[PDB]
């Protein structure tokens, strides 16, 4: 909400303006990288033993 | 395991390694001698006293 002054004079008058915007978001998805390995996971989460 | 940064962008899904690392040893002798002379032989065993 831009103010303004009184200006004297011979001069234009001031008038309050007023500025609606709005944005969107972005995304860029984002990934990881991971690496198990074989007689590893399966191994050590309930496989056998 | 190596520090990783999840990374975005349009590549590919960039390769994961998470394994052991093996090491050469070496070894070293480090050698020392003392001499000890034709007396504290007959010495120190009662052979000569």
């Given at each position: ?5 009184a200006?004297?004079?011979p ?15 972005d995304?860029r998805a ?10 590893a ?9």
């Amino acid at each position: 909400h831009q103010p303004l002054i009184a200006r004297d004079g011979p001069h234009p008058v001031e008038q309050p303006v007023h500025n609606y915007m709005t944005k969107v978001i972005d995304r860029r998805a984002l990934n990881a990288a991971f690496s198990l390995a074989t007689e590893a996971i399966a191994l050590l989460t309930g496989e056998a033993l």
